[PDB]
Design a protein around this ligand. Structure first.
Ligand SMILES: *[C@@H]1O[C@H](CO)[C@@H](O)[C@H](O)[C@H]1NC(C)=O
Lengths: 108, 130
């Protein structure tokens, strides 16, 4: 079964940078990635980023950086966010369909 | 934009019915990257029942109800660099309705740059004398 992983971390000693990461382990190429903070994409969450493999990257506040990563995955950086905030990543892939998972900052 | 779907669709057992789904209104610059039909209440390996790619056409990954009983009514894939694909009418058709087909169906458009836009429809299978 296809699986979507989501990881959000503070990867700097300055402790002022949220890093959102998510990827898709499937059998087809990605047609679109939608990233939302607070809930599922198009179902309560606030749209943060939309990524298309050819048409480019689309991002909204407070996304300072949204980019593709290797092996069917992406990364996102927030400006400045709370530790209990949930970030959801939905991958639309042919021919297997759409798949979504959510994650949050792990406890200290 | 919005997804136009009917709240409920009624079909006869063993018959054929259509689940309307449209992305309205037409917006220049809005690109539909993929259409996904899901049975969100069916197990994880059975949720994704139908998908349509602008170039490669349709797919039906879940065996239930499977490609033998599902079809896209009006979705047309692209025919080269000349003609653009037409995915705005994502109406799905079910053939040979069974009682297993009753329930929720979601129609989602993976759009650029807007994102995921989805609507839901409940399919009611009418059993004779019932
Ligand atoms: C999340 O954490 C912040 C700061 O600790 C707090 O103000 C807020 O109430 C929390 N939200 C929930 C839903 O607990």
């Amino acid at each position: 079964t296809p699986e979507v992983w989501v990881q959000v971390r503070m990867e700097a000693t300055e402790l002022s940078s949220f890093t959102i990461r998510c990827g898709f382990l499937g059998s087809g190429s990605i047609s679109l990635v939608t990233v939302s903070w607070g809930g599922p994409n198009g179902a309560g969450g606030t749209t943060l980023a939309v990524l298309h493999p050819e048409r480019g990257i689309r991002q909204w506040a407070p996304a300072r950086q949204a980019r593709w990563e290797t092996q069917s995955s992406i990364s996102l950086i927030l400006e400045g966010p709370c530790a209990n905030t949930t970030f959801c990543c939905k991958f639309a892939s042919f021919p297997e369909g759409s798949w979504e998972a959510c994650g949050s900052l792990p406890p200290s | 934009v919005r997804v136009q779907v009917l709240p409920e669709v009624r079909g006869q057992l063993g018959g054929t019915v259509e689940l309307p789904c449209h992305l309205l209104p037409p917006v220049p610059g809005l690109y539909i990257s993929l259409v996904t039909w899901q049975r969100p209440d069916a197990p994880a390996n059975h949720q994704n029942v139908a998908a349509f790619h602008p170039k490669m056409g349709p797919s039906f990954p879940s065996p239930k109800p499977g490609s033998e009983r599902l079809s896209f009514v009006s979705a047309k894939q692209s025919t080269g660099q000349d003609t653009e694909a037409e995915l705005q009418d994502a109406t799905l058709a079910l053939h040979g309705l069974t009682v297993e087909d009753e329930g929720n169906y979601t129609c989602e458009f993976a759009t650029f740059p807007k994102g995921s836009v989805r609507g839901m429809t409940w399919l009611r299978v009418l059993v004779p004398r019932l």
